[PDB]
Amino acid sequence: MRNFPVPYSNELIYSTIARAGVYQGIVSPKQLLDEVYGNRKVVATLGLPSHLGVIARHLHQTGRYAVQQLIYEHTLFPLYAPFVGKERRDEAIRLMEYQAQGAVHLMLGVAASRVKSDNRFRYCPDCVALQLNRYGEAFWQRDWYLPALPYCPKHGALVFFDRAVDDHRHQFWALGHTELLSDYPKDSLSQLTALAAYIAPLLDAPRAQELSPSLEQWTLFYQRLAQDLGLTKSKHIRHDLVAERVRQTFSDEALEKLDLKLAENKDTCWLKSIFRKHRKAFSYLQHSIVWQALLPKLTVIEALQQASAL
Amino acid sequence: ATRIQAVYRDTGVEAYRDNPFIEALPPLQESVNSAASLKSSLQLTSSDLQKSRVIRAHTICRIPDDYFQPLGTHLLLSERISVMIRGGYVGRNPKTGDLQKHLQNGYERVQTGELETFRFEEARSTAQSLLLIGCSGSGKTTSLHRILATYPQVIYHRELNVEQVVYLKIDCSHNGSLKEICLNFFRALDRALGSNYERRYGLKRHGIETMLALMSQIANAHALGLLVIDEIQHLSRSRSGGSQEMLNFFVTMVNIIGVPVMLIGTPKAREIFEADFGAIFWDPIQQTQRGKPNQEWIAFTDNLWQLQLLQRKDALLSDEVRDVWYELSQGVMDIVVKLFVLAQLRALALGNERITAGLLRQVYQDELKPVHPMLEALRSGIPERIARYSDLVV
Amino acid sequence: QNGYERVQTGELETFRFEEARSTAQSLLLIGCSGSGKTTSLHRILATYPQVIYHRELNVEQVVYLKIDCSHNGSLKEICLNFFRALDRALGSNYERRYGLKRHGIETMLALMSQIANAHALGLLVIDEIQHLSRSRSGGSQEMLNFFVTMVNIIGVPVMLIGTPKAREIFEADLRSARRGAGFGAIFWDPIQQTQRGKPNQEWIAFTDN
Amino acid sequence: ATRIQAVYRDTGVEAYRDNPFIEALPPLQESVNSAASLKSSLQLTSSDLQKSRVIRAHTICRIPDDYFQPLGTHLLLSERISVMIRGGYVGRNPKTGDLQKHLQNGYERVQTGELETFRFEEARSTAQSLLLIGCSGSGKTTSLHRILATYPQVIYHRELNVEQVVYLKIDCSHNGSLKEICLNFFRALDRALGSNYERRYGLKRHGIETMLALMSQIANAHALGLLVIDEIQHLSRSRSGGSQEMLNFFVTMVNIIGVPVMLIGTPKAREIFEADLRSARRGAGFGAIFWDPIQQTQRGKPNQEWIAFTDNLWQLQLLQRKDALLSDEVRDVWYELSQGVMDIVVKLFVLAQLRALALGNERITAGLLRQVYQDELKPVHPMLEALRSGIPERIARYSDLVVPEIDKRLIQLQLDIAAIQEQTPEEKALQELDTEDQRHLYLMLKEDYDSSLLIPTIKKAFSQNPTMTRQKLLPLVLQWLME
DNA sequence: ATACTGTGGACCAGAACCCTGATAAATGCAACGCTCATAGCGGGCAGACG
DNA sequence: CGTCTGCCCGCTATGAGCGTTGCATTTATCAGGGTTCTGGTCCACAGTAT
Ligand SMILES: Nc1ncnc2c1ncn2[C@@H]1O[C@H](COP(=O)(O)OP(=O)(O)OP(O)(O)=S)[C@@H](O)[C@H]1O
Ligand SMILES: Nc1ncnc2c1ncn2[C@@H]1O[C@H](COP(=O)(O)OP(=O)(O)O)[C@@H](O)[C@H]1O
Ligand SMILES: Nc1ncnc2c1ncn2[C@@H]1O[C@H](COP(=O)(O)OP(=O)(O)O)[C@@H](O)[C@H]1O
Ligand SMILES: [Mg+2]
Ligand SMILES: [Mg+2]
Ligand SMILES: [Mg+2]
Ligand SMILES: [Zn+2]
What we know:
This is part of a larger assembly, with 1 copy of chain A and 3 copies of chain B.
Chain A: H1 13-22, H2 29-36, H3 54-57, H4 67-73, H5 81-84, H6 86-96, H7 102-107, H8 125-134, H9 190-199, H10 215-228, E1 232-233, E2 236-237, H11 241-249, H12 252-257, H13 270-275, H14 284-294, H15 300-309
Antiparallel strand pairs in A: 1-2
Chain B: E1 4-5, H1 31-38, H2 53-61, H3 72-86, H4 99-112, E2 129-134, H5 140-146, E3 154-156, E4 163-165, E5 167-171, H6 180-185, H7 197-201, H8 208-221, E6 226-230, H9 245-257, E7 261-265, H10 270-274, E8 278-282, E9 288-289, E10 292-293, H11 295-305, H12 319-329, H13 335-350, H14 357-367, H15 372-380, H16 383-387
Parallel strand pairs in B: 1-3, 2-7, 2-8, 5-6, 6-7
Antiparallel strand pairs in B: 3-4, 9-10
The complex binds phosphothiophosphoric acid-adenylate ester, adenosine-5'-diphosphate (2 copies), magnesium ion (3 copies) and zinc ion.
The structure holds a DNA duplex.
């Protein structure tokens, strides 16, 4: 290819590859994969893409875009790197730069979505107007495609329509302006919007480049934080203050929208699994909700500072 | 294929204040310096006059390829081409979000197969058109290879990634078949850029309707400046329904798509245009401009005359030789140079090292016989007699 | 690039960035049948070697290539015979790789240029142009349009040979006549016994030898 | 074209008895010392130290080409290649009959008569087709270029009008093609023979089968010793065709030609032949001699190869402030810096002297080697750490990496060395002193104390007796100093 | 101050998966086939005389 | 009235451009096993009742 579009500010690479075929009258879905990569077996993925580097060689004559900038600033990889572990973070890039695809989701053992859960194509009613007025084009954005919360962090709730990534595995689709974007009455859960606003700044923050606290470090930090202001009895978990904080700040309908039911009656609950010694990777939702419940006046980056320092 | 990095100017006109495309070109020049810039000649030097005969013969024969002189009209043509190639980028600005609309609409025409489909009514296109009709042998192609050689062809930007192509030139197929013009547009952007658009767009058997939209969208994939079409007379020789099809597609492209187009052809191709744009007519030069002999003829004859390579020659020119030239050639720009070169070649070969009128007459009547019948009509001057044949003034 | 900065900063007022090729000229040679227009060409062109291979570069220089027209008369056999006469001087298989039936005439003409630039072709002589005066060529003006649209081949000056029957029928338009005699049209004639009442030394010497 | 007339030595081995092709080869009785005599090195004296810094820069720039120290694997490769070369002519015996006549005679004798049992096993090729897989930057090509050039290439016979080509070298290039090797064999035969085989056999019209068919004829006509295909790593799989059909093509090459053939490659190219290598099948052949970098430790102690190479390479230093003994810390550090890869170990030492001649003090420090490592080993950062990791996949993925265009960088090093203004105090001392063979005493005893008194004392003694040998001069200059 | 009970961390084991090879069916695509227009041709009709 | 010896014209032959079609081709569908996964288990350990 001779004219590969430069990615806009804060967009996914999937929409960039789509606009790389919208701009030159290529309508057969096979030819786009034939020209961009050269293989007819390459897949289409939203968040954590692979085969990167071939997408950077096209932009090579521009000295700015490289592999590291593409992966950190233009994917959904920032959400998984700091929390899981340092060595896995450092090896994910070398596993992802090359042609391997199956190992990417396996090694980062959190992407067991099974059936495509909310992988329907999503957009926002108000953001598209701003993108139109300031650019003249519409595209997919990383703010919309948060893995769990189906809410735009600034405002409102995303507009689901009926299609899926598994409907066509070998097709890159760009957003169509002539495809009608119809508004619906906004049904918003304010707690979910607040959580989205709280978790948004981590996506574009330089300090998340290398800071990943260790497993034992996580355990000591959580024990010390629980004992700082009295969330732990003498060698026993209180089980009451932890529940009443999260029920004060979060209601039950928010938790069922997040599919994160608490189980005080049942012994196996994720809240108790967090406070016990960690052995597997944990999602950002649990850490975020614990941070919000335990102390409400601290930012995500400085929370990671305090977690990692001690 | 001259890849050049772009460094911008600062234009004065407020309409061009933002574009990178129109601020990447070399500046337009005043008519005073433009006439001097175009002119080129030979190095000559007196050291060759006493060299061998064979070494002199090739230097004599190298006259017609390296000798250009600007006439009166070329200074108008350069200005008009500059204006018409600068006026086609104000509606495709990438900074203020205009190329994205002009390029997004072109996908819809590809999908449905109609060229009148539009998605954004705000997209406005500005373009111009011209035709350059002149008698054969008047040197109109070389004018469009020397005026349009100041602008470099492929310029590469770095803020964007667009590889702008400033000008492109195609030749219509001899049969005029409606598929080969589209198949030859992907064979000039194929060599001037070093790619393989032909394989991905031509081998896959598509209809003409979709192949016409593929052209109009690929031309806007880059920033095409000028699509000049040479040898337009072959369009009349196609099958039925094609004579008007690409006299409507080439005005659809100018009006809707927004790529400027200029057509160049012979006088016998004017009929299809008039079977139903600014018009510039080119005519062979004549000495008898109003009541006194023209200065251009004398100046050009002296400039060509000072390139002789004969050991014993007449430095000053005589008017009888000028009259012989004007009565044997009739002023068409091809005959004069070839006639002079042949005359001095025969003079060098014979042994008589000086050019005379008799030698000119003998060479003209012995070596240019396939050309005489048409020149008889030009020499006679009768309108009815000159009206026959083709490629003559009408 | 340096000229580009000098013209952008205002120091230099002009530059010549790139100039296309304008060095394509042809010639026609007609003479009465039996006057020796072919054995007077093979022996002249037998002095220049055909294939020259350069070590410094990686190109092969085909100095000249001789094509003959067919017996019936059409453009497609000329176009394919170019390939059939090119694959013999070199070692190659152009005829089967490129000379397929799917391609039209215009595609073959546009495709000859790539091969004529890959090897620095110098001269292309077409003889026996007699056969193309009247045949199932699709039209005299169409075949003339072919012979004038043969300008898009990269340079490669061409020489055309035919009987005096070819001239009057074949050159009857200014735009094609000026391209036939682009470098003078050489005309041939039989030997004359009496020059001006004096015996010619040419005839005497030839007969005695 | 060393067209020496065949002088027929006698070898006591029964298998090589009375073979005109074999006897023309050099004898092998003291070849062990000959194999160990491959060692070459520059000659450096103390005189070159006082020269100007550009001359020293040229001398240092000349070290990579003319330095070679044999190691353990070179002896094994030499003996194996000697066995392959000399065992390859037992079949094509010219004086007696060929192989097919022998098999037919054996069958006719076992039919009737009293020849009870005849074995039809015959020769698999004539020796095993060795496959010398190793990591790039280890030194295969120079090893073959030296150990295969001690045999004369052409032995022009007298009674038989045949040419005994002893070895040959095909070499692919970047983005090669399958037919390119077949064409290049014919093209390269011309340089070894002086003929024009490309004109008659090198036509592009021929298919892939016809090339091998003609190669069989020409390889049988000229008594061929070896066929060393090199740099399989450079080939591109997708351009030629099916990757798995390359193994079929190579097997067809090995079967048809019949002369011993030895390929070279990198662990990236191993996956092409891995199907035959894993099986212990006889007939697949393709025995592999693995090339590995120098190991630091042996039995919990430093390996003698590493120290033996290190001291020999360290003797070539001409630094002005140089100490006699190599320090242990740098010995510890550059191995982990370079992982023992043969090429880059020498390159770091080459670049260190050039960098130290310009940065300031003329010595060797760990920080200097680190700085050179971040300077000119950027393309090879991934492969070095892959070797450090030890996982075979990491090493396999990062093979074929080489530093581009080091020679051009050497020129700009030299140009930067040329342009300098200030001078060292030792430079001043050598310039002001009459350093015409009187310099040697000053240099050998400079580091004992300050040379301020030394500069006039040697002059005093030398003017006292102008006619002395340095041998008698040393006691006197030593005696006057202590006073 | 030691038996009783919670409990956290370490630990068995069935299960959804999911990857891969063997086999039938839909299918795109160079491979001829067809059509269209165009230029020369030999049996048939008007003609015509002794 | 035979015949006649050259005219024509509806015809036959043929180049030029485009359009199906069987063919190879890829794609899609089904049985099966073992593997990592996570669900459930427990057991020594630490802190309280008698
Ligand atoms: N103004 C001029 N000054 C100098 N030489 C000229 C001039 N005009 C024409 N010529 C010469 O005439 C020839 C130009 O003729 P061409 O390049 O063939 O153009 P053309 O044949 O007139 O274009 P056509 O007939 O429409 S295809 C070259 O030999 C030029 O050197
Ligand atoms: N100068 C000459 N002297 C003798 N014979 C000649 C000469 N020129 C031509 N010929 C004869 O003419 C013949 C070639 O004629 P040719 O060029 O084929 O005619 P055309 O050009 O009409 O085909 C040869 O057989 C040769 O003998
Ligand atoms: N004993 C040695 N002394 C110095 N340099 C060596 C020695 N052995 C190998 N080399 C180095 O190996 C390099 C060539 O080998 P290499 O390039 O690895 O082969 P290939 O080109 O097949 O990869 C040379 O630059 C040379 O400096
Ligand atoms: Mg022209
Ligand atoms: Mg002839
Ligand atoms: Mg090598
Ligand atoms: Zn929004």
